[PDB]
Amino acid sequence: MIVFTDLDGTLLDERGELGPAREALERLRALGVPVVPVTAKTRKEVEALGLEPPFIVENGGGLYLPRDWPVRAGRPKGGYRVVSLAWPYRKVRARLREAEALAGRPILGYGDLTAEAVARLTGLSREAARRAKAREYDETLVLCPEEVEAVLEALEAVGLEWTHGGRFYHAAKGADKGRAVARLRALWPDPEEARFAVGLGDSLNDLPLFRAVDLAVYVGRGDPPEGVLATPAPGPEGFRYAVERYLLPRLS
What residues make contact with ligand PO3 under the rule CB under 6 A?
Answer: 6-9, 39-41, 165-166, 203, 205
After which residue numbers is the chain interrupted with C–N beyond 2.5 angstroms? none
Q: Nearer Cβ to ligand PO3, position 154 or 209? A: 209
Closest separation between CB of residue 166 and Mg ion, Å?
4
How many whole angstroms separate alpha carbon 196 and alpha carbon 234?
24
Which range binds a second copy by CB under 8 A, 25-33, 73-81, 113-121, 226-234? 113-121
For 222, other C-beta atoms within 10 Å of its C-beta total: 8
How many whole angstroms separate alpha carbon 89 and alpha carbon 79?
22
Position among 160, 203, 212, 231 found at the interface with Mg ion (CB under 5 A): 203
Instruction: Pick one of ligand 2M8, ligand PO3, Cl ion, none as the site partner of residue 140 (Cβ within 5 to 8 A by kind).
Output: ligand 2M8
13 is catalytic: no
Position among 106, 123, 244, 251 found at the interface with a second copy (CB under 8 A): 106
Rg of the chain's alpha carbons, rounded to an integer? 18
Closest separation between CB of residue 168 and a second copy, Å?
10
Q: CA of 250: how far to CAs of 1, 33, 98, 185, in Å? A: 9, 12, 49, 19
Position among 22, 29, 90, 120 found at the interface with a second copy (CB under 8 A): 120
